[PDB]
Amino acid sequence: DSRYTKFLTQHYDAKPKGRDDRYCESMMVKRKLTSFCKDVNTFIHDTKNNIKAICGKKGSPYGRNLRISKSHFQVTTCTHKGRSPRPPCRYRASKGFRYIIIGCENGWPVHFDESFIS
Amino acid sequence: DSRYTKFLTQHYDAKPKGRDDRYCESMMVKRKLTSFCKDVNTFIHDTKNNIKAICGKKGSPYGRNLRISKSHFQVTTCTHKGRSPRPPCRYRASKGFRYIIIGCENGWPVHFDESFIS
Ligand SMILES: [Zn+2]
Ligand SMILES: [Zn+2]
């Protein structure tokens, strides 16, 4: 599954190396998100099985093509902190344990909604 | 100023047409931010003079190359709400009146920091 694999590349990191700003700066490069300095990207620290389950009965519909998780997930959200959109890109990390919203297609996670949840 | 003009294209809208989801969807296209569905982008509803002043004495240093405004600004933050990164792109709007963080170069606004402020 192409879109599922792309989602994993962008958002899945089961054993994160530190969850700090350096982690974000390294991972944004390693996962190919710095062609321009992408402003927001969240890495999820949990199993692929648990993330995928959000697209089934362990998620709730959250408007068209979105599902919100019924369970909290450990996450690290990387946000751009520089003045230039050209790499190298500087990031701040924000750790969280919260419900997450994902875009689903035919039972598979294909996107991560990066908007604010409170 | 090329980078200043780019900033204005991306972030300046003095008389916004409605500040709702449709506003976001229209403006993200009009301001050329939907080649892929950019996940977050804020439009500022104030004068160019007031925004620029953030890069001077009406801002405070907020870490390298960033300044936080001393005054609140009316803003509409557009966030992607779809499962696909390919246009057409669907958005939600979030209106705010808050301090804003911008990236400055030689006294000119050149970037908008899209991270969470509380
Ligand atoms: Zn940026
Ligand atoms: Zn998106």
Author numbering:
A (entry chain A), B (entry chain A): 3 to 120
Can you list sentences taken from the study reporting this PDB entry?
The murine Ang family, over the course of evolution, has expanded to accommodate six members: mAng (the murine orthologue of hAng), mAng-2 (also known as mAngRP or mAng-related protein), mAng-3, mAng-4, mAng-5 and mAng-6 27–31. The main-chain of both mAng-2 and mAng-3 adopts the familiar α/β fold that is characteristic of other Angs and members of the RNase A family.
The buried surface area at the interface between the two molecules is ∼1100 Å2, consisting of 33 amino acid residues from each molecule with a total of ten ionic interactions across the interface. Interestingly, in the mAng-2 structure, His82, Asp41 and two water molecules from the protomer in the asymmetric unit, along with His113 (an active site residue) from a symmetry-related mate coordinate the Zn2+ ion to complete a penta-coordination. A reciprocal set of interactions makes up the symmetry-related Zn2+ binding site, resulting in a head-to-tail packing. In the mAng-3 structure, the binding site architecture is very similar to that observed for phosphate and sulfate ions in other Ang structures and both anions ligate the same five P1 subsite residues: Gln12, His13, Lys40, His113 and Phe114. In mAng-2, the productive conformation is observed for this residue. In mAng-2, Lys40 is expelled and ligates a sulfate ion occupying the active site of a symmetry-related molecule. The mAng-2 structure also reveals Lys40 to be reoriented out of the active site pocket, making it ineffective as a catalytic residue.
